[PDB]
Design a binder for this molecule. Structure first.
Ligand SMILES: CCn1c2ccccc2c2cc([C@H]3C(C(=O)OC[C@H]4CCCO4)=C(C)NC4=C3C(=O)CCC4)ccc21
Ligand SMILES: CCn1c2ccccc2c2cc([C@H]3C(C(=O)OC[C@H]4CCCO4)=C(C)NC4=C3C(=O)CCC4)ccc21
Ligand SMILES: *[C@@H]1O[C@H](CO)[C@@H](O[C@@H]2O[C@H](CO)[C@@H](O)[C@H](O)[C@H]2NC(C)=O)[C@H](O)[C@H]1NC(C)=O
Ligand SMILES: *[C@@H]1O[C@H](CO)[C@@H](O[C@@H]2O[C@H](CO)[C@@H](O)[C@H](O)[C@H]2NC(C)=O)[C@H](O)[C@H]1NC(C)=O
Ligand SMILES: *[C@@H]1O[C@H](CO)[C@@H](O[C@@H]2O[C@H](CO)[C@@H](O)[C@H](O)[C@H]2NC(C)=O)[C@H](O)[C@H]1NC(C)=O
Ligand SMILES: CC(=O)N[C@@H]1[C@@H](O)[C@H](O)[C@@H](CO)O[C@H]1O
Ligand SMILES: CC(=O)N[C@@H]1[C@@H](O)[C@H](O)[C@@H](CO)O[C@H]1O
Ligand SMILES: *[C@@H]1O[C@H](CO)[C@@H](O)[C@H](O)[C@H]1NC(C)=O
Ligand SMILES: *[C@@H]1O[C@H](CO)[C@@H](O)[C@H](O)[C@H]1NC(C)=O
Ligand SMILES: *[C@@H]1O[C@H](CO)[C@@H](O)[C@H](O)[C@H]1NC(C)=O
Ligand SMILES: *[C@@H]1O[C@H](CO)[C@@H](O)[C@H](O)[C@H]1NC(C)=O
Ligand SMILES: *[C@@H]1O[C@H](CO)[C@@H](O)[C@H](O)[C@H]1NC(C)=O
Ligand SMILES: *[C@@H]1O[C@H](CO)[C@@H](O)[C@H](O)[C@H]1NC(C)=O
Ligand SMILES: *[C@@H]1O[C@H](CO)[C@@H](O)[C@H](O)[C@H]1NC(C)=O
Ligand SMILES: *[C@@H]1O[C@H](CO)[C@@H](O)[C@H](O)[C@H]1NC(C)=O
Lengths: 526, 527
């Protein structure tokens, strides 16, 4: 099992999947380790070893903070890294069907984590099932997160910002220069990613450097116009300056700040990232993408409205309860271990927690919009309200607006609304269909019948798996039995979208129009 | 001959022929001493007697007031202008009685509107002879003082205590109690109905102890004391009467000397300065209106309503489809009686600027956001219509609804109506729709007279508003007939059923414009 890469030589393994074989290569180095002198710099292209890389283990995950609010609880720990953490973490993975194809479309996964956490080695990103079932190559990479990936002194080559985005980019260049050795087709590449991964993907639609490096895009629960997705340059270097004073790295010219920060033990970077912004929010992104003048030329929303982006089909969508996940990270009244019925005023306190900088008039205007009950008996009205507020403002409305404004340039867009709750999901039922819990289905996890899903969830996952393959290969997410419902194109006038659950595959119009038309045409005025 | 002996003296009236019958009418019976000279700005003083015979055979004088002059010759505007001479000597009332003369007829008593600044009972659309003829009820109407002559307020000071016009109405109610049995009516079946400021007056009479024994039920058309125009807080009342003193040259420090100074002033200097007493003001500003005087009103009206200190009786309440459109051609930029009045978006908020002069710009943008979730974002009319609705919902509809809910919650049966039919003879343009005040014709049965080019549908619809109003008067239930009319159900605060009125179909519906009123009741007060 040995493949010659354009620079180098890797040994992989035979995984046996569903009766056949997928050959995979785990932890291929795609960049020099960004240590010491290179901490905070753009990833630098590798020199050529030859020897043989045993690409037979997931590589190290990038340095990051780890959520430990619930020790020994699957629902939070399943997003925690599962390989050792090092700054030596710029590696990627490749799953390939067996026997080896000759021009097979490839899907490159980009994980989410609020640009602060995440790794490609998580079980729910296992590429073997895709490769097996749909005969695509799957590739996924580790990029830097947190200040190690996004610390910004705009314009200074060292610390330019967006270094994790350049990590992703360099992996995409690796697939361009090497996937054809693996049997992949470089002219047929589809980015799919979720959360910050999806926002990352949307940012690759705008960066000129990334233009030639893929074909299509799939954006799950994220896009760069999300309020958490982009940091202004003013915010970004207030944040890096406070990181400097928190580490004792306060100097007067930027370069000396930077080398002081480079002779700091990584845990003193990581354990101070939490304090750089004074009014955090459960969704605060401490160090995220900025308009760096390199990766991002100007501010993304105008590049989108001006139309200077790559022109291709995109697939975009959201889950029904995107917001509930974050309500337990400090909204009063809310618990993983009770039903979380709240009053109107626990509601209002929750809104302060998520909208700290908003006038009281503005928080009540929110409440007004989300309190026109259809059934005012319903106890859990306010629960549902607050979750829906967080989810709409942070994910659903930005995704709708993004594909709305993307489609009006002759590009074909498909939008989905995922509404099934995993029968083995470990969070309470009141949280519904949570942020991130379609990924098990996009990666075909429930196809393992030994695994505990329900035949229904298996059929559903097989549907979503082939729709995204077909979108990757063809640019149209058709299902090619034609039992299936056909999925039409989102365009601003009609705005049609497709519903994903086990009961049915309905087709619907103008998703949450009345909620989002607040977040688009009123809130920005408060 | 035609003579009735009243306690104050005997009066003479008129035979009128109505639909091959006769109602007998007594027009312009005095119910009080003329509020002249020393009596200006004070409560109505009781009449004593005359030994002569007072022929009640013409409408009396209307009360001193300013007049609508923006549209000379336009029946739509002038139909509301007073149609008799104007004079402080104006406290007179009218009595329509069916023939043969009734023995215990229930009595409808009408209180007119006009923003407490204008109006009079002698208008053609308040003619009670049809009701008397068709439903066999006595109809009674009265003139009460409007404007500063009616509502000048130095609270506490008998010389001008506030609310004299309301006391005028009340003294007319006392006249009905003391005298109507001589005409054949039942003093213990007496329903007050009124419109606009008249319906506000009716709701206040439900609040006021002194009116409690003077009537039995109440009908409220497009009006209620909780409308934002109906009541002025005590202070603000006294500050306008103060500035009126300042404009006429009546600023004294012994506060009664002010009242003397104005009492020697010529009526039209007072009328002439009444508009200026409020800085700015909307097309709906009530310059001198009801106030918390501590006599007619012992507390802020909304307090009394919450505490349940009001008369426990049955009520009929409703509104019109387009309560607001009238007020747009009176100051909103881009509106006219004569073009279709398609306006732009913030021509729209020059409109809100005009009708909400004291609201923040965040509040006005929120009003706009609430009213611009179009069903058809390519419909030109859309903004025009929105503004009508805004002015309408805020000023009449949502308060009527709110009043009926809270009134309903104390155990009495309320009935709510949505009046939805445009008079074919309506003179205003069609874009104005079912305007404020244009139900009154149908309630008073003018469409029953088959000689004024009304539609047959309109006759039928007037006949049923008439017999429903009369049956509510007599029986507490606005049934038309048991067996092929729609049940008019009670307004209960849970369901909030109401009955719509128009020529095509009467239906029961629920929660009239609940999504708008929600904004007015529970977001706007926080702004
Ligand atoms: C910046 C911190 N941050 C975010 C910021 C924006 C959007 C999503 C996340 C996000 C998502 C996660 C994870 C998460 C969650 O529950 O975490 C809560 C956050 C709040 C504070 C620390 O952890 C879910 C439900 N799904 C997913 C998570 C992931 O990290 C992978 C994508 C799916 C973790 C951190 C996260
Ligand atoms: C402040 C003066 N004011 C009001 C104030 C609040 C509510 C209604 C009116 C009101 C109603 C009227 C009259 C009117 C109208 O069109 O007048 C416009 C006024 C407003 C400013 C200048 O002229 C209609 C449509 N219907 C009715 C009117 C009345 O006179 C009562 C019967 C119904 C007259 C004066 C009025
Ligand atoms: C759900 O659980 C939470 C957490 O235990 C409860 O809220 C806590 O209540 C205690 C006192 O009773 C406070 O000291 C904590 O600060 C509260 N925590 C939070 C996060 O609010 C809540 O009462 C429970 N709700 C229900 C419906 O059982
Ligand atoms: C006129 O009508 C009233 C009822 O509307 C007649 O009866 C009085 O009604 C009150 C109720 O308010 C009762 O408490 C009295 O006991 C009734 N009186 C009598 C004598 O029965 C009233 O009598 C009628 N009068 C005429 C002349 O018809
Ligand atoms: C409307 O309803 C009333 C009942 O509320 C009908 O009955 C009249 O009122 C009382 C009963 O509450 C009876 O003693 C009267 O005798 C009834 N009226 C007559 C004329 O007999 C009333 O009849 C109904 N109206 C119509 C037009 O059917
Ligand atoms: C240098 C190095 O790590 N070599 C290893 C080798 O020892 C191992 O036996 C084989 C996998 O079976 O390939 C690789
Ligand atoms: C028609 C008629 O006779 N009307 C009488 C009149 O004769 C009398 O002189 C007048 C005095 O006010 O009262 C009235
Ligand atoms: C890997 O699998 C292929 C076919 O699945 C087989 O031909 C090959 O011998 C295997 N190699 C190893 C080292 O297991
Ligand atoms: C790969 O497939 C593409 C079609 O997408 C084709 O243009 C190209 O010639 C193929 N090359 C090889 C080596 O198969
Ligand atoms: C950074 O932000 C904090 C919070 O707003 C503020 O107090 C501080 O002055 C800002 N600037 C610096 C240099 O820290
Ligand atoms: C930053 O400060 C050090 C301190 O001496 C100096 O040597 C270096 O040249 C400075 N860099 C500048 C001014 O760009
Ligand atoms: C999906 O599209 C491809 C090419 O567009 C076609 O070959 C395939 O048959 C289609 N499957 C359907 C329509 O189910
Ligand atoms: C009034 O009308 C009645 C009929 O209702 C009639 O008998 C009487 O003579 C009339 N009297 C006068 C003075 O018109
Ligand atoms: C009272 O009227 C005067 C007019 O000069 C004005 O200055 C003052 O603000 C008014 N007060 C109130 C409470 O309206
Ligand atoms: C309607 O008439 C008024 C008064 O002349 C005018 O100001 C307005 O511009 C006109 N609008 C249209 C659309 O004709």
């Amino acid at each position: 099992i040995i493949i010659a890469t354009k620079n180098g030589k890797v040994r992989g393994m035979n995984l046996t999947v569903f009766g056949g074989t997928v050959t995979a290569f785990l932890g291929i180095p795609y960049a020099q380790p960004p240590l010491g002198r290179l901490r905070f710099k753009k990833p630098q292209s590798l020199t050529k070893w030859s020897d043989i890389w045993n690409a037979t283990k997931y590589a190290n995950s990038c340095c990051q903070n780890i959520d430990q609010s619930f020790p020994g609880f699957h629902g939070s720990e399943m997003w925690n890294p599962n390989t050792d953490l090092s700054e030596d973490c710029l590696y990627l993975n490749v799953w390939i069907p067996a026997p080896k194809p000759k021009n097979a479309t490839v899907l490159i996964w980009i994980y989410g984590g609020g640009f602060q956490t995440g790794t490609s080695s998580l079980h729910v990103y296992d590429g073997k099932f895709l490769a097996r079932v749909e005969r695509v190559i799957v590739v996924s990479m580790n990029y830097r997160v947190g200040a190690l990936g996004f610390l910004a002194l705009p314009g200074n080559p060292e610390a330019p910002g967006n270094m994790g985005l350049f990590d992703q980019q360099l992996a995409l260049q690796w697939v361009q220069k090497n996937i054809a050795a693996f049997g992949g087709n470089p002219k047929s590449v589809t980015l799919f990613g979720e959360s910050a991964g999806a926002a990352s993907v949307s940012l690759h639609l705008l960066s000129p450097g990334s233009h030639s490096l893929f074909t299509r895009a799939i954006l799950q629960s994220g896009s760069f116009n999300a309020p958490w997705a982009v940091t202004s340059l003013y915010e970004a270097r207030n944040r890096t300056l406070n990181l400097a004073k928190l580490t004792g790295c306060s100097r007067e010219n930027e370069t000396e700040i930077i080398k002081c920060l480079r002779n700091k033990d990584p845990q003193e970077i990581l354990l101070n990232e939490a304090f750089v912004v004074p009014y955090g929010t459960p969704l605060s992104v401490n160090f995220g993408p900025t308009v760096d003048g390199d990766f991002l030329t100007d501010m993304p929303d105008i590049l989108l409205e001006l139309g200077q982006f790559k022109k291709t089909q995109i697939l975009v969508g959201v889950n029904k309860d995107e917001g509930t996940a974050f309500l337990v990270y400090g909204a009063p009244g809310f618990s993983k271990d009770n039903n979380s019925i709240i009053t109107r005023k626990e509601f209002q306190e929750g809104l302060k927690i998520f909208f700290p900088g908003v006038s009281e008039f503005g928080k009540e205007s929110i409440l007004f919009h989300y309190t026109d009950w259809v059934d005012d008996q319903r106890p859990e009205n306010y629960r549902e309200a607050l979750g829906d507020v967080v989810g709409d403002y942070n994910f659903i409305c930005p995704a709708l607006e993004f594909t709305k404004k993307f489609s009006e340039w002759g590009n074909n867009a498909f939008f989905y609304y995922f509404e099934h709750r995993s029968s083995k999901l470990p969070w309470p039922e009141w949280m519904g269909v949570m942020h991130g819990y379609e990924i098990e289905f996009v990666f075909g996890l429930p196809l393992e019948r030994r695994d505990n899903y329900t035949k229904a969830e298996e059929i559903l996952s097989r549907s979503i798996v082939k729709r995204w393959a077909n979108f990757a290969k063809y640019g149209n997410p058709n299902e090619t039995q034609n039992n299936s419902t056909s999925w039409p194109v989102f365009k601003s006038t009609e705005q049609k979208y497709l519903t994903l659950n086990t009961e049915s595959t309905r087709i619907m119009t103008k998703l949450r129009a009345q909620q989002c038309r607040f977040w688009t045409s009123f809130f920005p005025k408060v």
